[model samples]
Target: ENIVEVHHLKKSVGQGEHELSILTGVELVVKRGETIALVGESGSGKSTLLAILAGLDDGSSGEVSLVGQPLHNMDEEARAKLRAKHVGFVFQSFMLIPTLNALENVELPALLRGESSAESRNGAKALLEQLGLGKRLDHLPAQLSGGEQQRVALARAFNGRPDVLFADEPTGNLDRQTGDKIADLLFSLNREHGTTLIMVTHDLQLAARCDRCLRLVNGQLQEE
Candidate 1:
């Protein structure tokens, strides 16, 4: 089954003479449970495509479908529900709430979707333990290492059993050793959880680890 489809997708910034095209009439499909890599040089529309796929940004024109539903037809509330239900995100920044502890961070998003604290509550703990952060559940993001915080973010993304995970430069801020470990954790957990993943990165070696790799060049996708 297809989890994502983009047809005639385009994105642009500015107007007329100052206007710049970032992506143009892109067409793509991603199957369920597949691992795909999106690679490009700096400012080459990799993250723009990720944002469109995850329903965080609208394409200037074109149709985008997520989990088989057309994004162009959905309102903000519907898009929020769709994202909260089937889509999870992990950014290089970790994007954790400063005031919330690890446990709260993991459980809160699920709570918004109407899942109770007791049910997803347990899943969050279990996942944190699985990610080797069981002892740090009460700590703030400021206290945790970059890698540890990334793991916490990972656990939270899985708290709701997301159908598709959109990760952008997940290891971008970590050291090489830590980045490798995090990379391993991402693939291992993704395989076991059966969640389809799409990651955007500049790391060619990291991109190669995925089942499919595509490069964006001059606003178009080309298989690599």
Candidate 2:
């Protein structure tokens, strides 16, 4: 089934007369268990398009649907609820909560869904261990290395078993060796759990790992 659909999406930034169009008539579709890369240079609107697909932002015109639910048609509260239910995101800067330990950071989404504390913690611990973070569960983000922090972020993103995963520069902040390790782990998840993957990346190695690649230039997506 198609997990994501974008039809003629258009987005603009800035106010009325000063507005800059970022995406114009963009069309795309993503199926379950498929992985696709959005590859582009800086300022290509790749991140903006990912945000709109995740329902974190709305398109100026056209349609976007997640797992058949119309994103643009929903109110903010409704969209937030849907995101909590099915969307998972890994950010470039490793957006982990400073106050939370590794396990808690991974478990937060489940806790937000009202899972029992024990259940959430157990699941988070398991995922962290599987991601080679077994011994670092209690470490704060500041206590870990850059790669470790990103691994924890990956664990967190996968904790909820999301139907659609959006990763923005998942390995952008790491050294080549570390970045490759993270990329391997990501694709392993795609293979093991059949998670749908959509990532925005400048790393050509990472981009090439996906099933298909889409290059964004001049606010348009071109198949590469």
Candidate 3:
């Protein structure tokens, strides 16, 4: 049932005399449909570990497996394929495309995977409707409120029904009220779709909502 496995994972920046270690000998296992919160202070390598888990970055050494496939062993093209297959990410910055409207933004992953435009559009529309943004599908990110933008991002992340989700500071950019709404939406989607969730956050409230919590300190992880 392990959706993700990491062993002796290390990520170091620079080289030789200038080398700085960001993650050191990290080991972990994440099960399907489980929600894990990764908490730490700034510069603790939480985000680095999340990126490795999501196939966005390579580890300096050791192994990372997603859904039993060796991610660190794969080439960039293979890793990209894995991401398109079973992984979804919600970034802290709400990385929606400025030129694309809400619908196009949400349909991006599907389109990338060679889904027909009509099919992708239909799926995106359904997701927007579910997220209460049915009427705003044609609006650009600049015209939407912070909460709306985040909701749209959430819809996009869920559009392809990814098996595993990596959310980095999902509510970090929202006000308290809007953050709560985003939290609710995340958990609701997790419950409905049974997606394994690995979240990086500084919010204690959000961390408490997860099935388990781990803290990263000095390049190591410990149970919270």
TM-score, model 1 to reference: 0.97
List per-candidate RMSD values in Å. 1.0, 1.2, 1.2
Tally clashes: model 3. Answer: 0
From the highest lDDT down, the ranking of the candidates is 1, 3, 2
Give me the overall lDDT of model 3.
Answer: 0.87
Report the Cα lDDT for residue 132, model 3: 88
Which tens-of-lDDT digit does each residue in 1-224 have in candidate 2? 98888888888899889989988788888889988999999868787888888788778997888999998887988888888888888998898889999999999998877678998888899998788889989998998998899988888888888888889886777888988888897899867988989988887877788898999877777898
Output the lDDT of residue 143, model 1.
92
Candidate 1 clashing pairs? none
In model 3, which runs have C-alpha deviations exceeding 4 angstroms? none
Instruction: Provide the overall lDDT of each model, using Cα atoms, as 2-decimal numbers.
Output: 0.88, 0.86, 0.87
Model 3: colliding residue pairs: none
Candidate 1 regions exceeding 4 Å error are: none
Error of 3 at 70 (Å): 0.7
For candidate 2, give the lDDT of residue 190: 67
TM-score of 2: 0.96
